[PDB]
Ligand binder design. Structure first.
Ligand code: A1AHX
Ligand code: A1AHX
Ligand code: NI
Lengths: 236, 217
């Protein structure tokens, strides 16, 4: 069904799939320790992951894949998706990151846990970049869907006829989301040149999000969701 | 002048700046020794290649070093994927150093093979390749501060390379829809190259000061 959707049907489907805004654990002890703020962030992320899977299952084309391929897309993309959500939430709070409505953190609280101010600075620069570009909500949901479908696709096996069918399918859906982004920009009134340029600028920011996600795992070096956990939530 | 270049001038300039394909040191008639020595010599060519990317030398030396520091392994890797594209299942590190999976950390070499396979399926063209390599150079470090004038300039050059890619595809006969779809497909592969670079880096060298002396000289 996904490949039959027009651009406006794709946008509406992506807007309606958006997950809820969650709150941080209420009234933690402030100031934080390294241990306590990692604890609040982990608990927030663990609760967001559940709604991430519900969102994923509503991204057109995602459910057509095997459960195994779905779990690998989520394994590769989950932190990037959490991060892009954080960046989108933070756009109108320059210099700060809005993890939840009740957990707004500035740069110098990032210094709390070792290794995290560097990622805070990158997250803040991405939020400024999105503010610079006047990123639109309809563009943001297309980007988040691209992250989900693209980040793990290069890891499909190609061993079998099916694996090529799975990976050709993802690329067809990614093509449709590209078409949808372009359609939104033409409907805004951008010229053809401006459309191609904005498309490239948005997709190039996705390589920075991938970088920050990689950087974050590396400073971390068992809080990442396991295959079995992601599979069980997918089947639930 | 970089902002005044036509699409055909951008491609010409990048094609003319392309480094040669280097050989491994083997003499007959260690794997890392060989790869390190190869990368060592490719980096010397990379620095002088970067100075010829339109708009790059307009930046302060500090910003030039910051971009090279962030992109050097991505650049080596995209060069390897390009070379290996017509050798399915193998990585052509050099014409005399062609390795298969067994000879390989293996994870990165599975990822490199998947990238080469993707470029093969898309019939990636040499003119598109040089464009993508320059995008890696200019884009990988820009969000890490490479101030405001520098960042704007870089974005105007990136917009020119976008125009160049679109022009190439229009001249190859692609429809407007195909042009934007292919642009997106090529740029999404850069996210995977960034990931392979990060992984290789964290499985494990040129410092900030090394790159600046190399680029001073
Ligand atoms: C389990 O893997 C990682 C990988 C990286 C890191 N980092 C810390 C050095 S980080 O700075 O990269 C990451 C960005 C932000 O801070 C961290 C965090 C978070 C995630 C999950 C978790 O369990 C605990 C903390 C974050 C986060 C972002 C958006 C969101 O909606 C919720 C939480 C921590 C855990
Ligand atoms: C010092 O930094 C690194 C970071 C990562 C790695 N890796 C090792 C596991 S890797 O697999 O990610 C990377 C891809 C390929 O194998 C590696 C490599 C290479 C680079 C420089 C060096 O001194 C020695 C080896 C390679 C290479 C790729 C293209 C090219 O034209 C020449 C060499 C090695 C060194
Ligand atoms: Ni796995």
């Amino acid at each position: 069904l996904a490949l039959s959707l027009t651009a406006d049907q794709m946008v509406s489907a992506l807007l309606d799939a958006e997950p809820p805004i969650l709150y941080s654990e209420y009234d933690p002890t402030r100031p934080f320790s390294e241990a306590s703020m990692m604890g609040l962030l982990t608990n927030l992320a663990d609760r967001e992951l559940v709604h991430m899977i519900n969102w994923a299952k509503r991204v057109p084309g995602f459910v057509d894949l095997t459960s195994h391929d779905q779990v690998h897309l989520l394994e590769c993309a989950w932190l990037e998706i959490l991060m892009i959500g954080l960046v989108w939430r933070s756009m109108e709070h320059p210099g700060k990151l809005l993890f939840a409505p009740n957990l707004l953190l500035d740069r110098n609280q990032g210094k709390c846990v070792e290794g995290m101010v560097e990622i805070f600075d990158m997250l803040l620069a991405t939020s400024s970049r999105f503010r610079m570009m006047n990123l639109q909500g309809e563009e943001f949901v297309c980007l988040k869907s691209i992250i989900l479908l693209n980040s793990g696709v290069y890891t499909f096996l190609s061993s079998t006829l099916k694996s090529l069918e799975e990976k050709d399918h993802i690329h067809r859906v990614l093509d449709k989301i590209t078409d949808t982004l372009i359609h939104l920009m033409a409907k805004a009134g951008l010229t053809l040149q401006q459309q191609h340029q904005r498309l490239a600028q948005l997709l190039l920011i996705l390589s920075h999000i991938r970088h920050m996600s990689n950087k974050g795992m590396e400073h971390l070096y068992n809080v990442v969701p396991s295959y079995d956990l992601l599979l069980e939530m997918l089947d639930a």
